[PDB]
Write a structure and sequence with these properties.
The structure is a homodimer.
Chain A (H helix, E strand, L loop, with lengths): L8 H16 L4 H10 L4 H15 L4 H5 L8 H13 L2 H23 L3
Helix pairs in contact in A: 1-2, 1-6, 2-3, 5-6
Bound molecules: calcium ion (2 copies), chloride ion and sodium ion.
Chain lengths: 115, 116
């Protein structure tokens, strides 16, 4: 039996926002992933993003690469990325995913605060 | 001015882009293009225009002292002068993120307890 957990809601919000911002600026996907990793304060997240990037540099899509961490990026997240990649809208779906992740962080906090 | 979350957003985005090695004017263009808030887009385009004309970022931000306070602009100035804008922006992003997180949690906790 194996078992791994995802990352915190703020941690997902930060990296999704950074990746969306970098991709939308017109930088190569691999270079965007390098920057998000290198700017991370979270060793596990840094390692994960180095591994996602490693797959991207072998030529795989972002969605397929995120596939190596299904415990972190769920099927829906990876489906949204794939939809963007297939339709030529990776930039605007990453924006959507960033907005989603930030809203998720906020609502999780709203639920739990003062408990 | 603008909200605590919106300052955190643009500061994180600008820090992220600058630390990637992208020229400052190009970074400012991207943050502008990506903004949902028309007022913020306007401000960033105006700041970008000034930077391309040779004004420093710190001097340009002084046109919006209601958004970028004396500490913020002072920090940027120190970074530009020293050739370390990249790391100063990172610290401003961390600071702004932290402020948003801690203030948002107080807001939510206050809402939750006060209205229960
Ligand atoms: Ca948005
Ligand atoms: Ca940091
Ligand atoms: Cl893991
Ligand atoms: Na799917």
């Amino acid at each position: 039996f194996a078992f791994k957990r995802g990352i915190s809601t703020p941690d997902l919000a930060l990296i999704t926002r950074q990746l969306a911002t970098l991709v939308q600026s017109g930088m190569p996907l691999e270079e965007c992933l390098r920057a998000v990793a290198e700017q991370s304060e979270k060793p596990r997240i840094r390692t994960m993003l180095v591994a996602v990037r490693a797959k991207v540099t072998e030529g795989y899509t972002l969605s397929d690469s995120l596939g190596d961490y299904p415990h972190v990026f769920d099927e829906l997240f990876r489906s949204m990325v794939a939809a963007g990649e297939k339709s030529g809208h990776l930039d605007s779906v990453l924006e959507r995913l960033a907005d989603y992740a930030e809203n998720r962080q906020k609502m999780r906090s709203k639920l739990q605060q003062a408990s």
